[model samples]
Target: STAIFSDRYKGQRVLGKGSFGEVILCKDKITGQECAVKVISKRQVKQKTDKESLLREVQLLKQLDHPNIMKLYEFFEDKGYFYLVGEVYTGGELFDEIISRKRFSEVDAARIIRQVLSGITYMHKNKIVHRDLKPENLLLESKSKDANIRIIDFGLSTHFEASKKMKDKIGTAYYIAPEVLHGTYDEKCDVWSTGVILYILLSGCPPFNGANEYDILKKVEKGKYTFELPQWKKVSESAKDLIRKMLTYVPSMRISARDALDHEWIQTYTKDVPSLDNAILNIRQFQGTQKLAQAALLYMGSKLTSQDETKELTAIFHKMDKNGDGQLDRAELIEGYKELMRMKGQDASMLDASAVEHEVDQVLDAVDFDKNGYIEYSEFVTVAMDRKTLLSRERLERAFRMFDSDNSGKISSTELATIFGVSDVDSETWKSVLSEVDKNDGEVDFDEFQQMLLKLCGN
Candidate 1:
């Protein structure tokens, strides 16, 4: 006869519920230990045909044990219900705390992110890749003043050899990696997701956002993000630089978890641990220029966002209008050239008085396409576009050639590090670099090389 244990579990207050099941706060009748019991209906799970997923989750949990990872107490199955018992902690999700606090200081953010990286590196070392790593999955051990974080929910994790290629597209969209979006990915994908979470923690907003899913996806595809400093600028260049590397559009060029710990920003935190502990203890008494610098960065970002680049031309026309008119005559155009040069850091004495006339003749010859003396706004835009494109193409080609040192049409990690000025070149660093620059079977093509260079140079 099977013994019944339903009554053996007490304290059935519901903690939370998800699509799969509900988590309830429970107590062991005999040991008197508090626990979180995740109840999953077999019928519901079967109906959803997620048995494989459930089983995988159980198997993954069984094989892992670390201080930073959530501990699985036991599992029970009855009639049609499945229950997973885990440690109960009063502290809520880390994301909730961060939201309530508005934002984390650089020191606090670095401390938390470093712990995240440590846990991730351990998981990767054991060949277990956490497909879904986000703020929601991170929880605190207790509601105490200094709570330690524990990463939970391995339901979407999988094991893969570090050398093998991963091609699954899973995880929440906002935090998804570009390689995953393109239908290819690996453990490093989680690093990118973590980077996004770090950005949110520091800035109180996700780096990329849109009105809709499509718009967000487009922004992700373009790797379009802004660095508004003075506020965020005080955070540390190394930290910002690390974020840039992790959020790179080319997956093969993104930084790895191990390398992330080696970044200068993280090192700064590690070096000042004792002093930081003292500061945190006397939180109210701590004072530094970093806070002021951060405020300045925020102010500068606001100013930049409000300025309109296109209006510069209109302002120029107004200034050269002479008779309170909106149009510029030939003489006015010539005068505008001299003023433009002055604004561009050139001395009036360094330029010929007729220099404007000489440039005007050249502009008329090239920009008028139709050989007309008069130049319209369309023609002006066209000339500017050609020059900008030419300069952009030249920089890209130069970067590509620098990476393809052997002229073999391909680049390796060593080649990329050299071009990017990455100082350290150890075996671990090489592995991290390889995972980033090698997009093809085992090498980087010209397109990948060019894109990586543009990102490093901030183009």
Candidate 2:
């Protein structure tokens, strides 16, 4: 029987709790689709005006359509609760990744900054300003390599006019601009938040810091900050220069998201640059401080080359998922790693037995956002692709062998056909796929194969 309304929606437990509302994980009885439902109380709606405000926010959310922005799937009232049902982002917070990751790189931070700026740029263009922009509110669908982040929590977000100004004195303490404190500011406040985030991204610390919150405010108001920190030694002047432009004591002179996007630092990140020493230094500070769950370490540690976090992770995940089930357990994870070792001619028992068990638990703690005993395919795949280290030579060899049927060093025309299609060599799909993957002619050698993989990784 099709269990459309088998019983009722089983909301296991609370995912998070805000003051007036709470978000929980719920499942669709018929389709079994996972969703995050934000429940608000009608009782709290003491006045008609309050109810109207909720509707306006809902209407605004419903109108927004972008790949990077979080989507509001459906809304309804049930059991005296106004439920704002939306797509679920189970991976977790971006700041959590920054603090928990062992090896944060410049490129990593740059990529995040770029995406955030891109999101805000869209908002600004649409006459929206996220007054409360912070790392905590930004979420990754899956916090792995090339993870696409969505900006969430628009409780404080409001529409603004270009000619007029928004003077609400809103936003976070550390990231708020000086003009905001004066109770008269514009869209530039969010830009200041971006600057502060970028500062933290580079130095793993705040721009203005003191022994107490009071002193911190004083420092920020006075525009007191320095690029002279120890970690700043390796940072490019271009990055520091841009930070200076973004974080300003004056709202009039402060950089807007639009202008910042055009800055050389953000532009250069798209191209290859030197090692991210400033970025790396920030993460290394916490290396010896605390031992993270093995799951977090492994997930953060894996080197992801592709910009498409989903594609690269999906390819690797399919291999790990030996069973047809759309999930992975401790047994599955252990089996996958063990299979890798055996294929490399190593004995799994030669390593720590109990330690292996403990490690899997630690991994579960880190990646299993739902806290489910068995990891869903989404959880495992998302975490697996995040690489603390670059692609290993051995692993790259396996990717090459998968398509190379006869164990030939090179993939011939026929093998290429098998990989692509039947004599559709000049087809748009065939040319585009092979153009990046194959630089050489008919015979794709090991060198050609590596080039292809890296190019694919970059994709």
Candidate 3:
């Protein structure tokens, strides 16, 4: 659950200027967190369609929870502009990073592409299409070579359907796919863009380079490009094969994001192993935690979890998900729990099979907040986060400020409704939830909220 921030954003530095408005570096007064506020002018977004697109972008971002995707903390609308407060990336654009380096080693390139595929796979699964995918839209979380790739700029993105084909002539010229320019395409267009980025990453230049946009556009239409001699020499055959599949002329024939993630080239960089010793114990403790507190923890887990923590947890999730289906089934979770226990020096042979299955069932019952049978990417992170760090005082207060949207020092039913995505929750349910987290008063304040979360998480 997410809610708009009540604290005013104090703009400190101008980040960039664009047609809609300028993005500024701002400090969220309540959390004391540095964020980017994309101050989009309502006046600048003149047309009705353009205005609707802006709001749609907000709704789209609200649904995304992948570590690689940009996080929209909250948004506020004034009479003249909309303030979109989000995490600030220090690594700058992937385009600039690549330009400086000229080209990257296959391992480095695979690392970047793997993250992109993971994010895209999540988006596509949720029926959202990032219509605009390019190096410019990709940002680095930090300046380090191993920084996480952040996919941003979802202005052109929209909800897509499998039965209907999109016919918009959007996206950058060089990265545009053949089917996209032909006025009929699907989510595979993004795959084409990724292929373009991969080609540029391995070599110093674009696959379909030319003197002008028209020349490049013509080349993309033909869908013909060869691996150049010297530049392609160092790149692996598996990497090139994956690119060919992604950049295929026909949309149906193009490789899917999920398949690309499991591709040998991408998997070659999968070096992270699940090492959390007491992850199963944490899940066991997490069961029977207060529902309100569980929601609050989930909110903070998504919002306040550090980048390093998020990445490590994500790596662990991927490692445990042996089937590469972006989710952990009952068997997968059982296997993962057994592996963790074994890693902690417990004998797998000593563990009773039915008892282990029962323990896994309980873990799934607790962590599967959505009750969708399998645990998705975000669910794994939320339950797997370090409890002490996840329930920190600073994060709790920040979460409290978000829930107490009216700034009355207490969360009312209206505020709860907005954040919890509920309308008119029964009084009995509210009573039980608030009784655990709120003072005798029928509302929750900072002190009561903090105490409830800490006690429930067993702090």
Candidate 4:
């Protein structure tokens, strides 16, 4: 039975509670679909100015349509209360799962990070910036070992022209970017958040943590983080390198989402997948392999090869290399490194002159995989494609099956909404889900549903 938007929603079981509202699970009486409903109290909304916030979230979510981002079905106003319905993911928050699991291996971390970057890139491309980016905002579709991630909670997100600068303090204290703390920022602020997330994933803690919010903000301002290789012996060098670029202290110097896709570590796992264009076309088939293949393709396309493609990267790297050294020196690296370490609950160590020199050499070596001492864009592309054959097609197919439980030829909004237990179920909410399944009539066939399910499962 489909759930109604009236008092009946109160009968549903509680999924979660927030300052402005509560999320409940319900059944749609008309379609016999199970759905989650978010009931925002009008009194709370008026007191906190949360009505506007909720509206902003809905508008932003409506403009976004990516596999890694959460799907919002509809927004309705009934009896002075606002209802936001979305796809319910049983996987829960990534932060909770990561803490329970202790920590992820390098490969696992890279995979998750890749998805994060992909989602952020998609948002940035659409002129949206998620001001609040951390593990808490990241949700999983299931508790399975191979659960796919969905970036959720856009309450603090904003939309600005891609070329504009954003000057506001809107994120959690610990994960906030340096520029944001300084009262000026842009989309790159999200990139800084990505760096913080990467550090947490690798270290099982954040890159900036203190006794209180003020202290943490101070550490973030000072760009404090540490990298004692011995402390992270289980972590990989490539992973470390990715973090280094992401945590660059100067917001203007931070790597863009596109450039992050080109980082050697990301490429090592994502090359050889089909192109994003082809993957989008293939999505209709509901083939899990197609999803992974598309991920690989889209990831590859994200690399900034030509000068016009990555002007921001070129500008930031040049700005940070103050001495025109063409590379980041110890002092510059330490500033960013300390910031990350502080977030991860580690003490800063004195910079090892020899180690610093060695690391610089390694960075150059990695950038120049062909041993030319100078990195050509084409060479970097080669590195990304090196591991193309390692993707597991069959594994992806299995993941797809898990999400397409009904074998309906495609995933329907009803199936996804029920699967995720979304609190608010509406036509708008299901619209996004149908789009992912590549359905034309707001419904999914079997194969399209299977393929989308697999992609969401991270297969």
- For model 1, residues 54-109, the per-residue Cα lDDT tens digits are 56656767777876777887776666566777887678877555534423467777
Q: Tens-digit lDDT track for model 2 on 317-350?
A: 5677678576776676656544443332211121
Candidate 1 collision pairs: 229-297, 230-294, 230-296, 230-297, 231-294, 231-297, 231-298, 252-436, 253-436
TM-score of each: 0.51, 0.53, 0.51, 0.51
Model 2 residue runs over 4 Å out of place are: 1-10, 18-20, 40-50, 76-82, 99-102, 155-171, 272-459
lDDT-better candidate, 1 vs 3: 3
* TM-score of candidate 4 against the unseen true structure: 0.51
Top model number, TM-score: 2
Cα TM-score of candidate 2: 0.53
Task: Please list the C-alpha lDDT of all candidates, in the order they appear.
Answer: 0.57, 0.59, 0.61, 0.55
263 Cα displacement, candidate 1 (Å): 1.8
What is the lDDT, from 0 to 100, of the residue 319 in candidate 2? 74
The predictions' CA RMSDs to the true structure, in order, are 25.2, 20.8, 25.0, 27.7
Candidate 1 regions with alpha-carbon error over 4 angstroms: 1-8, 42-60, 77-81, 99-103, 157-171, 272-459
